[PDB]
RNA sequence: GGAUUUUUGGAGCAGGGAGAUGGAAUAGGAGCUUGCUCCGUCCACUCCACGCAUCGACCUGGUAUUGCAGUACCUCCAGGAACGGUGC
């Protein structure tokens, strides 16, 4: 059995990038390096950039702190 | 023993085969259907079978009134008031009544929203052509004495008397 | 501090509440529960583009409530008070 | 259920019930009912079937 | 205080309007504290649909009123 | 505890408004803005106000603004969507 | 601790029973599984949608999150839930 | 309180999840949570033209899982 | 076949709705009384059939006695006694005064005497080819003489039931 | 007792484009009635991209099943598509 936490923190421990995508909204995702989470399932993205799958635009922010209520799924992507 | 708001308050409610709310009023012998105003439109169907009602008439504003059953009683003529005072009644049985001529199906043409009429085991049904004058009235109708009216039927009904 | 009890001792008034569909419903508060569970009794509801209807009782729940519009004749000031 | 000793300290409703059904029972039986107890011969065969109650008879004298 | 609000309406015939614009009219005969109303012959009216005993949940609940006599 | 996060975090910016008896507004979910000054209010936001006015805009379903007031009302806060304290009462 | 809606979806595990989601999807079949969280879990299912996608599946499981509302049969609403 | 979902009987198996937006991936479980949070390893995702896309080891949220359908008999 | 509540209707049209020849025999089975539910389905193994079980036996034999052959939807259906006794059934449930009876079966018990003269109401005794049965009321006793002329019950055997004499 | 399955809400908003197309009986403004011209609100038809594909309910014709049960729904073929929702 793989807890979701544990592979959170495995995650955070790689410091790979990750996508994640928002509840009901299909059009407009996130994706960067997740360095930290709490019990609320916070993420901090640094370097963070917001995809748009409907313009195939890419818009950086920087230090994003995303909440755990509108992230519905997350993927580990190789770039 | 004619229908008051005690009997209708007293009478047995409960819900039908079809899931509607049906209130079971058989066995009372009403001479004349009034006093329907205690029920306040909470019924979808009214069991009215072996009473001794003379007309289909004096029932109050229901909406909710979709089904009506008037088998085994001396019905011989209908309320032309009908249509304001039931407009999505859709069930009429009206089987072994008095209804001898086809002229008391007159009023029986201002239910738009009727669709399922029994006008079996009468001396109305036993005329010529009776079937094609309900067909041709009433065009609303879509099953007439358990049989659904086909495209020739009413082509036959709209030929002849047009 | 707590709102519940302020919205509690509100009975026997007459206000009305508009719900997040934009039905509002005017009628006089008889039961008000520690979930916001307005139960009041000869009230009218208007629905979005509807007809108002008169219902003898009603009971709405404290989720569905957007607003609240008291009179201006409510001691407001003294209710406040624990 | 009457008041009589026999439903005396009994203070349930469920017991009192039974109890009822047990003296309803007992004192039906120890009584004399002549209508399924009794042996009638009657005169059809009128040397056979002894097997009559007290109702078959009345039905063939009818 | 009392919470005879939700005791006063059991074993009696209620309509609910859902957040979709749905009715259920139903003999409501318990509740709990998340408002599950358990429905015994209900019917769904937005056209008549035969459902019998629905058992809503208390999230799509809106608000509730008497639909008639206890049968 | 509970005081001290009330009066040093964001709801000491809702007590500076019962407290001074300035004006604040409040946009909700329904697209409209009521401006008013607040008289009570909560852990969980539930604004009682008075003397409230509230603008939107509706269609005819071109469109047009529209307006109105009211003299008390109470907002839960669920439908609380953004609270903008400005000195608008001087 | 336990509501009384919930253990008359508790007791009626076992029987032909169907669950309509938020989204109006039903998935009808027996109860295998109910927990206090209106988690149902059932076996040889059936999905019969609002958007009318009529399916076989041999297992479902639709939680009590996005469960609008569960049409069970009438053959436990006579005792003991007569209160 | 806080009693997790029955999932032991579901590790290990092919199933399809369903979430909100409509949104359909299917994939192996890999572990339970009480927060109704679902790890499938080597998920595969179906997009609108009806292509599969493999997105690797997910975690589905349960404050948008629709509906999980075990693909295989347990 | 035994006479029961639930009379079964079978060789009907299973072209139509289920829910609209539902009504329609509900609509037919409420002229001769009331219609307590109504079994009908529609697939491979029950199909063009439906059963309707009624709060009294007198009515349900009424229905299968009136309605036997007639046109339903296009088809003849015909009807007929249950096999079984329904569940809804079995939930709910769960001239002269003195009749004579003549050329009855030795096999019948009391049982089966007291569950035929269950069709009238309750009478005082019953008396054991040969039976004579009594009953309380006059005319539940001429309308049980009068119900038993040639009643469908052993079929290898035909019963006769009279009036006593005096 | 406002942080994922119930009560302090992830809800709000808008229905593709064109055509010397047609109508506001009593309800648009401006060129300061009436007639005409212009512009930010629908329905009916036609054209492109019957908006698209899916399944359920449903109507016509042909066709198969004669079977004793407590039910999401129930034969198949072809045409039409008035309805529902799903993703773009």
Redesign the pocket.
Known sequence: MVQPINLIFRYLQNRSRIQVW??????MRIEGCIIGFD????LVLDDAEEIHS?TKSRKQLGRIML????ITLLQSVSN | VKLTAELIEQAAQYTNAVRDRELDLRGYKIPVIENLGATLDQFDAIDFSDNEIRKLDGFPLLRRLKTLLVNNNRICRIGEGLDQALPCLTELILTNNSLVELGDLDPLASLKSLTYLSILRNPVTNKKHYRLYVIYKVPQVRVLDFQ?V???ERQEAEKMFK | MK??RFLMKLSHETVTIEL??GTQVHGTITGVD????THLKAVKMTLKNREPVQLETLSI???NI?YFILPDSLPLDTLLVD | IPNTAHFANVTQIEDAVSLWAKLKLQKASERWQPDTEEEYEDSSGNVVNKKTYEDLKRQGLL | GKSSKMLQHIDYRMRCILQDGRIFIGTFKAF?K???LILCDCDEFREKRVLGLVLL???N?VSMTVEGPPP | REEEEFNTGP?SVLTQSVKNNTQVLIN????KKLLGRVKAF?????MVLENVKEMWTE??????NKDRYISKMFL????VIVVLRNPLIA | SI?VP?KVLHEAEGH?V?CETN??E?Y??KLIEA?????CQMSNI???????????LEQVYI???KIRFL?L?D?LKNAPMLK | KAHP?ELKKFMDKKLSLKLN??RHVQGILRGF?????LVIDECVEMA?SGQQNNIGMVVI???SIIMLEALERV | ?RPNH?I?I???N???????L?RSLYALFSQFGHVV???????????????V?FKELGSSTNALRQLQGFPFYG?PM?I?????????ISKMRGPNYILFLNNLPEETNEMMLSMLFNQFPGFKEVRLDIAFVEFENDGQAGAARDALQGFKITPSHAMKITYAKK
């Open positions: 928002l509840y009901e909204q299909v059009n019990e609320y399932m916070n409907k909440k755990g209520d509108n | 659904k086909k495209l020739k | 709102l519940v997040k569909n520690v979930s916001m569970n729940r404290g989720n957007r | 709990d998340h408002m599950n949940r208390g999230e609940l | 709801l909700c979910r329904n697209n909560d852990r969980h936001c539930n269609v005819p379903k071109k469109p047009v839960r806060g669920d439908s | 509501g919930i032909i169907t989204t109006g039903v009808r079949g927990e206090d969280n209106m988690n059936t999905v019969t949608y609002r958007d009318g996608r009529v399916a076989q939680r009590g999150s049409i049969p053959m | 979902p937006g409509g949570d009480p927060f109704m949070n609108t949220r349960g404050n | 076949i639930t079964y079978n060789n009907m299973d072209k139509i709705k289920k829910e609209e539902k539910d109504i079994v009908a389905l529609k697939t491979m193994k029950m199909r063009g059939q439906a059963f079980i088809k015909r007929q006694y249950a096999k079984t006794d329904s569940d809804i």
